[PDB]
Scaffold this motif. Structure first.
Motif, PDB file in Angstrom:
ATOM      1  N   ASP A 110       1.028  -0.974   0.411  1.00 55.18           N
ATOM      2  CA  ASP A 110       0.087  -0.206  -0.119  1.00 55.18           C
ATOM      3  C   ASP A 110       1.187   1.665  -0.142  1.00 55.18           C
ATOM      4  N   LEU A 167      -8.597  -4.327   8.457  1.00 51.28           N
ATOM      5  CA  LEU A 167      -8.171  -5.331   9.023  1.00 51.28           C
ATOM      6  C   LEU A 167      -7.012  -5.528  10.230  1.00 51.28           C
ATOM      7  N   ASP A 209      -7.657  -1.452  -3.849  1.00 50.91           N
ATOM      8  CA  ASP A 209      -9.038  -1.884  -3.681  1.00 50.91           C
ATOM      9  C   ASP A 209      -9.269  -2.650  -3.263  1.00 50.91           C
ATOM     10  N   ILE A 210      -8.771  -3.957  -3.643  1.00 50.24           N
ATOM     11  CA  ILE A 210      -9.518  -5.475  -2.536  1.00 50.24           C
ATOM     12  C   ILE A 210      -8.004  -5.244  -1.807  1.00 50.24           C
ATOM     13  N   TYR A 211      -8.117  -6.100  -0.296  1.00 55.27           N
ATOM     14  CA  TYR A 211      -7.276  -6.888   0.380  1.00 55.27           C
ATOM     15  C   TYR A 211      -7.400  -7.764   0.610  1.00 55.27           C
ATOM     16  N   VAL A 212      -7.087  -9.083  -0.079  1.00 60.14           N
ATOM     17  CA  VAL A 212      -7.607 -10.550   0.722  1.00 60.14           C
ATOM     18  C   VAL A 212      -6.547 -11.002   1.560  1.00 60.14           C
ATOM     19  N   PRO A 213      -7.377 -11.522   3.290  1.00 61.66           N
ATOM     20  CA  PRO A 213      -6.315 -11.559   4.248  1.00 61.66           C
ATOM     21  C   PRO A 213      -5.599 -12.918   4.583  1.00 61.66           C
ATOM     22  N   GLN A 234     -15.967  -9.415  -4.181  1.00 65.52           N
ATOM     23  CA  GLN A 234     -15.960  -8.040  -4.067  1.00 65.52           C
ATOM     24  C   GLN A 234     -15.157  -6.956  -4.724  1.00 65.52           C
ATOM     25  N   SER A 290     -12.471 -10.120   3.675  1.00 66.12           N
ATOM     26  CA  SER A 290     -12.351  -9.363   2.162  1.00 66.12           C
ATOM     27  C   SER A 290     -12.290  -8.366   2.573  1.00 66.12           C
ATOM     28  N   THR A 291     -11.137  -6.517   2.699  1.00 69.19           N
ATOM     29  CA  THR A 291     -11.500  -6.036   2.932  1.00 69.19           C
ATOM     30  C   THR A 291     -11.435  -4.949   1.864  1.00 69.19           C
ATOM     31  N   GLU A 292     -12.082  -3.667   2.061  1.00 64.94           N
ATOM     32  CA  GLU A 292     -12.122  -2.922   0.404  1.00 64.94           C
ATOM     33  C   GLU A 292     -10.873  -1.496   1.358  1.00 64.94           C
ATOM     34  N   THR A 293     -10.539  -1.570   2.458  1.00 71.41           N
ATOM     35  CA  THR A 293      -9.335  -0.591   3.169  1.00 71.41           C
ATOM     36  C   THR A 293      -8.270  -1.762   4.003  1.00 71.41           C
ATOM     37  N   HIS A 294      -7.202  -0.738   4.038  1.00 74.42           N
ATOM     38  CA  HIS A 294      -6.822  -1.662   4.964  1.00 74.42           C
ATOM     39  C   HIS A 294      -6.661  -1.209   6.050  1.00 74.42           C
TER      40      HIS A 294
END
Ligand code: CDL
Ligand code: PC1
Ligand code: ZMP
Ligand code: SF4
Ligand code: SF4
Ligand code: SF4
Lengths: 117, 208, 105, 114, 81, 182, 186
Positions: free
Chosen positions: F140, G157, F146-150, F165, G150-154
């Motif tokens: 980042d 999380l 735009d999408i953050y996969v955990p 998403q 899964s999130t749109e924004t850092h």
């Protein structure tokens, strides 16, 4: 009766392995004859080269020689003999039978480093 | 009977002890100490002037064909006078054995490159140079193999910080990835995992 | 052939109109220094090759040779049969002998 | 206070200074190729001024092994600059870009907390 | 000729920015009499290599003190005699 | 949060419809621009082409949405090697200090619209090498995501959940309505 | 049956060890396979036979693939059946967390309990290794079944204590079923 292939990539089947092995052992003996007799490497090399020369002199067959020596195929014996000849011609330059050129410093070779005294 | 205790291999002990006395007898100029550790591993502790003539010897002798060189390892112990130690691990396929050849080296003092003996030392001796600054003389090309092209310093020394000195971020004014001094959003929490009671009485007087 | 010119000009006009409308419909963003850069994988950045040039020359020689093999389908019903057979057998046989000689040497 | 060591890349300080002059000569010859082959804002004169600044930063050293270490690392950076392995961002790391100049007076450091 | 390369060498020395337009002479050296540092003398040698078009070996370059020595070695390289 | 609606409550709720904007626009030009933006977002979400950017282990799961069990090809998703032909870049792995200008140049040569998926804890936030000397603390700081996969190796349902998403984000894109209100 | 170039030992198997056959039947067989693309025909037939196979596409998200009761997903903080939070702020999870994602700050509560004032897990730093649930003496921290987070924004999380408690409230049934069906293995 010669083998079709040695089983290893890049190694060719030797046409005359006995003469090559005897000439290489004679060259190793002529190399180590210049060394002083109190050196251990000269004595051990002379012993092993003499027993392998007796092995290549007693057995005139290839497969019987590979069975009697027991260290790989005879092409690997030629490779080991060339390697030992290179080693001996380097020993005549390096001269490693003398004393230590650098003794170990204090607290060098003990592993747990930060222990006091 | 003790089934939770690893039983040592005696045929890997007697052969390695006889070979350790053999290599101490054949090279008294370079070999200072041979030792058979727990776990049946043989260590040879050479002088720094004998890196090439020992590793050549174990390469080409009939009684030691240590023709494979698996890894060259650098350990930084800053307490000692010569802080770095260089460990060459050699595998013998003919006699089915392993040896470790250890030497001591300072950052300014160069070391003999084993690239003429084993060609894997073309790259492994670069890696220690990238991580400790151990200069290997008479090397084909001694470059920076793993760290960044603009990296200043050797990271795996114990006097180097864990998080480094600098970080990288994209600058859209300069339109490029620029270099900034380090500021962590959360610092590294140093845990004091020190044992106040000694647990090994056999290693109490192992230093002299 | 005059209808072929009209239909080829219509295909060219339709393709240029479709590409012009695609360039209008393309989303116009801010032009950049790095976006216009030629793509080399990852980090940013050939001489003359004689082997490919002799490949093109072999292609040219065989193409002009094929342009003499092309007419003789029509001529087979309107020529002397012995002369036509002698020229065709000699033509393809000298081509095959030349190909095999250039293979062996 | 005197020990005998193995020399790295030199045997005397005049030889080490001569090889450092070889390094400076090759860097000075490689400046206009660096300006031409990189998409950097710095010009040829600014690159030569930065080269002079990095040499007079290390002017203070005296030891033979230390100055040979510096010459070796400089030749490695030069070899990373002739063959283009460094990027435009790696070349512009010598000029401290995107860094605010920290003040030297005590009052501005006292207000800013440094 | 010796005068042509003499004028060429003095032209290239007056092309240098740090050297003042006075005190241009064949005899005087650059180290102690003039304000040139050793990083500037190698810049003069690279100016010689830029203008003349051929590289000077360092072992020849470290001997040089004065413009008289400069003419003394380039007269052998240019083959005027 | 909100409680998900009980079926007694949800039976009284009307159907949502495909359009997130709704068909209740006032002006005919605003309605026409809304339906044109709906068609444009349907065409954009109907085929996103991610780029073959596999840095580290996460990418071994990335091929596992190529795999026949999960089958990304029936979602418009197909890998492209060139960055010009690709819509999405999936940062799947560990971005290092030598990897930063390569990723920035590859992202800058990609044509806009550009959606970025951060796959895995090394891609967002630094992760298991967060205190390393040569690891960027998440991607980042360099590429806008735009999408953050955990998950550390995201399961492939979770990566495809990030893909869905992203498709919901693309379906929610408002361009012509913003142009009418600019 | 072609002859062996190298004699195969007992403990080894040799590939590409067969001699090339020189009898005319095998030469004509290899010649016809070269000229008429017989092995390519076998490859084409094997390829075409997989069109008639069942597709293995599992049709996400109406049908989801198999999981396990040991599965590691979203970290979550559980609670007692009486309602008190389980986490006694004993900090073995932060000591055992290899990426050091967990940050715990603890104060004594009004009734004298040990329970936390701050329990933060950086899920962008968390590697989902499950060391915290093994190092938890009570069953407080747990790996939930959820992985669609899964999130749109850092910043979303960066899990707080309230987010973990809401995850424990939301996912309590499946977590309790997995812990009931998995505790005797651990
Ligand atoms: C300027 C003017 C506007 C330009 C832009 C238009 C964009 C249109 C696309 C879009 O995004 O629309 C969203 C927009 C928002 O929709 P919505 O109101 O939120 O959702 C409607 C329902 O709530 C939810 O939808 P639904 O559940 O009712 O299903 C939608 C659709 C079923 O869905 C579809 O038909 C989808 C398309 C499938 C095509 C498959 C074949 C493709 C062949 C290609 C060659 O249903 C029907 O069509 C009714 C039943 C038909 C049964 C047929 C049985 C055959 C046997 O859609 C509309 O406004 C719909 C009306 C306008 C569309 C065009 C209608 C006229 C032409 C019809 C086809 C003639 C041939
Ligand atoms: C751009 C050109 C692309 C390549 C076109 C190649 C056409 C074949 C070459 C040729 O001379 O074709 C004769 C042919 C005529 O073929 P013909 O004369 O054998 O056919 C008889 C004509 N009909 C079929 C109508 C009965 O002419 C063309 O193809 C005209 C090409 C026009 C190109 C316009 C853009 C320039
Ligand atoms: C991008 C374009 C270029 C930007 C600048 C890049 C700089 C690259 C070089 C920086 C790293 C180095 O090599 S600096 C170390 C070199 N060593 C020294 O400077 C030692 C200085 N000591 C000396 O004795 C000399 O070399 C002088 C003092 C320079 C020579 O002696 P003279 O007789 O005065
Ligand atoms: S986030 Fe986890 S799985 Fe992905 S690259 Fe990093 S360590 Fe590997
Ligand atoms: S190990 Fe469990 S009870 Fe202990 S502080 Fe961590 S989450 Fe709380
Ligand atoms: S699963 Fe591992 S990384 Fe995640 S919070 Fe637990 S101990 Fe830390």
């Amino acid at each position: 009766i010669i083998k079709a292939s040695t089983g290893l990539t890049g190694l060719a089947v030797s046409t005359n392995p006995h003469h090559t092995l005897s000439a290489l052992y004679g060259k190793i003996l002529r190399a180590v004859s210049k060394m002083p007799q109190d050196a251990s490497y000269r004595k051990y090399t002379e012993q092993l080269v003499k027993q392998r020369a007796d092995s290549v002199a007693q057995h005139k067959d290839i497969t019987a020689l590979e069975k009697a020596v027991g260290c790989g195929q005879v092409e690997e014996l030629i490779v080991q003999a060339e390697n030992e000849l290179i080693l001996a011609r380097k020993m005549l330059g390096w001269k490693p039978w003398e004393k230590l050129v650098q003794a170990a410093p204090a607290k060098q070779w003990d592993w747990p480093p930060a222990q006091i005294m | 009977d003790k089934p939770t205790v690893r039983q040592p291999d005696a045929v890997a002990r007697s052969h390695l002890s006889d070979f350790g006395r053999y290599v101490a007898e054949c090279l008294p100029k370079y070999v200072q100490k041979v030792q058979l550790t727990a776990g049946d591993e043989l260590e040879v502790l050479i002088a720094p002037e004998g890196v090439v003539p020992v590793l050549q010897f174990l390469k080409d002798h009939h009684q030691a064909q240590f023709t494979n060189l698996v890894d060259i390892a650098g350990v930084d112990v800053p307490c000692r006078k010569n802080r770095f130690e260089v460990v060459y691990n050699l595998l013998s396929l003919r006699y089915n054995s392993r040896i470790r050849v250890k030497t001591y080296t300072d950052e300014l003092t160069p070391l003999d490159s084993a690239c003429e003996v084993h060609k894997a030392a073309n790259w492994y001796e670069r890696e220690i140079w990238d991580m400790y600054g151990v200069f290997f003389a008479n090397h084909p090309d001694l470059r920076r193999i793993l760290t960044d092209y603009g990296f200043e310093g050797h990271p795996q020394r114990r006097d180097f910080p864990l998080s480094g000195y600098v970080e990288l971020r994209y600058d859209d004014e300069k339109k490029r990835v620029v270099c900034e001094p380090l500021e962590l959003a959360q610092e590294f929490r140093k845990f004091d995992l020190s044992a106040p009671w000694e647990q090994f009485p056999n290693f109490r007087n192992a230093n002299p | 052939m005059f209808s072929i010119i009209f239909i080829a000009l219509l295909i060219l006009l339709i393709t240029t109109i479709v590409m012009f409308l695609a360039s209008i419909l393309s989303k116009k963003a801010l032009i950049d220094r790095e976006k216009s850069s030629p793509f080399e994988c990852g980090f940013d950045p050939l001489p003359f090759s004689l082997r490919f040039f002799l490949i093109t020359i072999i292609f040219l020689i065989f193409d002009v040779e094929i342009a003499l093999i092309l007419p003789m389908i029509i001529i087979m019903k309107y020529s002397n049969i012995m002369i036509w057979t002698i020229t065709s057998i000699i033509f393809i046989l000298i081509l095959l002998i030349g190909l095999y000689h250039e293979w062996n040497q | 206070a005197v020990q005998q060591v193995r020399p790295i890349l030199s045997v005397d300080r005049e030889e080490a200074r001569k090889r450092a002059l070889n390094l400076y000569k090759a860097w000075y010859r490689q400046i206009p190729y660096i300006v031409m082959d990189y998409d950097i804002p710095m010009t040829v004169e600014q690159c030569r001024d930065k080269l002079r600044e990095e040499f007079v930063k290390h002017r203070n050293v005296t030891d033979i092994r230390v100055i040979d270490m510096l010459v070796i690392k400089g030749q490695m950076e030069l070899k990373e600059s002739v063959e283009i392995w460094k990027q435009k961002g790696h070349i512009m790391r010598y000029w401290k870009e995107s860094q605010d100049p920290k003040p030297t007076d005590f009052l501005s450091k006292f207000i800013q907390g440094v | 000729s010796l005068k042509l390369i003499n004028e060429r060498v003095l032209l290239v020395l007056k092309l240098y920015d740090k050297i003042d337009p006075s005190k241009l002479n064949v005899e005087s050296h650059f180290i102690n009499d003039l304000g040139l540092d050793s990083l500037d003398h190698v810049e003069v040698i690279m100016a010689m290599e830029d203008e003349f078009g051929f590289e000077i070996p360092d072992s020849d370059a470290e001997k040089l003190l004065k413009p008289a020595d400069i003419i003394k070695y380039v007269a052998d390289k240019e083959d005027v005699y | 949060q909100q409680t998900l609606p009980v079926a007694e409550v949800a039976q009284n709720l009307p159907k949502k419809g495909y359009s997130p904007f709704g068909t209740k626009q006032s002006s005919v030009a605003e309605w026409s621009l809304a339906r044109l933006d709906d068609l444009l977002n349907w065409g954009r979400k109907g085929s996103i082409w991610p780029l073959t950017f596999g840095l580290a282990c996460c990418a071994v799961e990335m091929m596992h949405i190529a795999a026949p069990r999960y089958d990304m090809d029936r979602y418009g998703v197909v890998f492209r090697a060139s960055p010009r032909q690709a819509d999405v870049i999936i940062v799947a792995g560990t971005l290092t200090n030598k990897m930063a200008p390569a990723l920035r140049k590859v992202y800058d040569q990609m044509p806009e619209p550009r959606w970025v998926i951060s796959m895995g804890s090394c891609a967002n936030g630094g992760g298991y090498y967060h205190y390393s000397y040569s690891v960027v603390r998440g991607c980042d700081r360099i590429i806008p995501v735009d999408i953050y996969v955990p998950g550390c190796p995201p399961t492939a349902e979770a990566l495809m959940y990030g893909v869905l998403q992203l498709q919901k984000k693309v379906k929610r894109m408002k361009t012509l309505q913003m142009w009418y209100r600019k | 049956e072609p002859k062996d170039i190298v004699e195969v030992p007992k403990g080894y198997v040799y590939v590409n060890n067969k001699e090339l056959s020189m009898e005319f039947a095998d030469i004509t067989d290899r010649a016809a396979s070269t000229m008429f693309f017989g092995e390519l025909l076998r490859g084409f037939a094997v390829t075409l036979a997989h069109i008639f196979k069942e597709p293995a596409t599992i049709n996400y998200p109406f049908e989801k693939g198999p999981l396990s009761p040991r599965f590691r997903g979203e970290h979550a903080l559980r609670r007692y059946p009486s309602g008190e939070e389980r986490c006694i702020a004993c900090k073995l999870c932060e000591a055992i967390c290899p990426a050091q994602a967990i940050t715990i700050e603890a104060e004594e509560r009004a009734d004298g309990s040990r329970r936390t004032t701050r329990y933060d897990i950086d899920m962008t730093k968390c590697i989902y290794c499950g060391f915290c649930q093994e190092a938890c003496p009570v069953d407080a921290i747990v790996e939930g079944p959820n992985f669609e987070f899964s999130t749109e924004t850092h910043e979303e999380l960066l899990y707080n204590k309230e987010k973990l408690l809401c995850n424990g409230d939301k996912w309590e049934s499946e977590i309790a079923s997995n812990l009931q069906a998995d505790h005797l293995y651990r």
